[model samples]
Target: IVCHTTATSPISAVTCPPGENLCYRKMWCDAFCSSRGKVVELGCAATCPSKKPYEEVTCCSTDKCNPHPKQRPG
Candidate 1:
C-alpha cells in the first residue's frame, strides 16, 4: 500500500514494505480538542496502535486512504 510517509516538507508518498497492508493517520489534539491538531504521523502499518488521551488513530485498508485531520477556523 502507498501511504503518506512524513509530516515534514512536502508530503511524501512511499510504498509500504512487504506485509504492511494498512494505512494510518495519527493526530494529537489539545485539551479541549477544538483547535486544528497536529498530524503525529502518516504511514503504513500491519495494525493500528492504541491512542492515548487527546490522540486519534485512523486506519484504512485502501491505498493512500489516510487523510489529514480536519482544520478548524479560529
Candidate 2:
C-alpha cells in the first residue's frame, strides 16, 4: 500500500485492504471508528496486506509494502 487519503480525524479515516476495491469519496470516507481517535496523531498507511493466507489478518504500517493475501474469486 502506498497511501491512504488524509482524514480530519483518525476516526474518520478509511482505507481498504489490498485486493479490496476502494472508492474515494465523501460517502466512503465519512464513516468513523471511535477507537481510531485514540491514535489520531499516530499515522497509518491506507492499504495493508494480510498475514494469513486469505483467512486471519493483521494490520500493517508502511508505504508500498507487499504483504500477502489473495482475494477470493467471485
Candidate 3:
C-alpha cells in the first residue's frame, strides 16, 4: 500500500507516493458531528471543524502509508 492523498478513494498503488510500511489518511465523511463539510489533503492541516464531528486521524505502519498525520494547522 502507498500514500495516495486524495479526497477520493485510492485506486492505484504503484503510482502512489513512496512510504514505509504504513498508511494514513483524513476523511471528512461526516454530516452531523462537528465538521460536517470539510476536506483535508496530504501535507496540509486544518482545525477540526468540530470536536463533535471527531475528525479522522490516520496513522498506520503498514505497506506504504503516506498520508500520515500532519502537524495540525495553528
Candidate 4:
C-alpha cells in the first residue's frame, strides 16, 4: 500500500534534497507519495504555498513541527 502527504493525511517519509541530496530534499510527488500526509514538502526547500496546514513550514510528522511550538534561537 502507498500513501501521499497532505495537510489532512498521515506522514510516511520526508523530502530529500535535490542535485546534492542533503536529505529532506526531493520531488514533491515522491516526498508526498512516500511520506504522504505526514511528511510535508513545504517544510523543506519545497515551500508549500497552497493548502498549507499552517503558516509555517513543517517537516517530518505532526509531532515534528508545530506552528505554535517554540522556535530555535540561533
Candidate 5:
C-alpha cells in the first residue's frame, strides 16, 4: 500500500489470515478555491474471498494506477 505517492520510501505490505483480501488504496487532497481553501483526500478499499486487488483486479493491479492514475491535457 504505497500511498501519498510523494515520499522517499512509503511502502506497505500485509498478510491475510482467513477471510481477507489484500487491498491497495491511494489518496490525495485537492485544493478548492470556491470552497474557501478546501483540502480533502478520499479513497476506498474492501476485502473479499479472492486474490489481492493489487495482484488481480481491474485498474488497480499495477504501478500505473498510483502516483499518477490520471493525466490532464488540452
Candidate 6:
C-alpha cells in the first residue's frame, strides 16, 4: 500500500512492503492540542501502535488513506 512519508522534507509518497498492510498517521500536539504546535508523521505499519496522551493516531488499510491532517479553525 502507499502511504505518506515525512513531515521534514517535502511530503511524499512511499510504497509499503507487501507484509505491511496498514497505514498510520500520527500527529503530536501541545498540551491543549493546538494547530500551531503540531508535528505530523505518516507511514506504513504491520499493526497500529498504542495511543498517547497528546498525540493523535489514525490507522487504515487503504492506499493513501493517511493523507494530510485536517485543518482546524483558529
Across 1-74, the per-residue lDDT of candidate 5 in tens digits comes to: 32223223432233323432333333233334453232222122333234443323222432223332234798
By lDDT, the better pick of 3 and 5 is 3
Q: How many residue pairs clash in all the candidates, one count each?
A: 0, 0, 7, 13, 0, 0
List all candidate RMSDs to the true structure. Answer: 4.9, 12.7, 11.3, 12.3, 9.9, 4.4
Record all residue pairs in model 2 with backbone atoms less than 3 Å apart, i.e. clashing. none
lDDT of each: 0.68, 0.34, 0.43, 0.32, 0.32, 0.68
Winner on TM-score between 4 and 5 is 5
Clashing pairs in 3: 21-61, 21-62, 22-61, 22-62, 22-65, 23-65, 34-53
The true-structure Cα RMSD of candidate 6 reads: 4.4
lDDT value for model 5: 0.32
Tell me the deviation in Å of residue 3 in model 3: 4.9
Query: Which window of 10 residues has the lowest lDDT sum in candidate 1?
Result: 30-39
TM-scores, each model vs. reference? 0.61, 0.18, 0.33, 0.20, 0.22, 0.61
Question: Which regions of candidate 1 deviate over 4 angstroms?
Answer: 30-37, 49-54, 69-74
What is the per-residue lDDT of model 2 for residues 7-32, given as tens digits with 9 covering 90 to 100? 44332334445654332212222235
Q: For residue 35, what is the lDDT in candidate 6?
A: 45
Residue lDDT tens for model 3, 16-50 = 34433344456565343453343544422222233
Question: Tens digits of per-residue lDDT for model 4 on 1-74?
Answer: 11122323444444334521121222333233442333334232333233553433433332223221134898
Q: What overall lDDT, based on C-alpha atoms, would model 4 receive against the true structure?
A: 0.32
State the weakest 10-residue window (summed lDDT) of model 2: 21-30
Least accurate 10 contiguous residues by lDDT in model 6: 29-38
List, residue by residue over 25-74, the lDDT tens digit for candidate 1: 77665334554445457778787666553566768777777756444899
Comparing candidate 1 with candidate 2, which one achieves the higher TM-score? 1
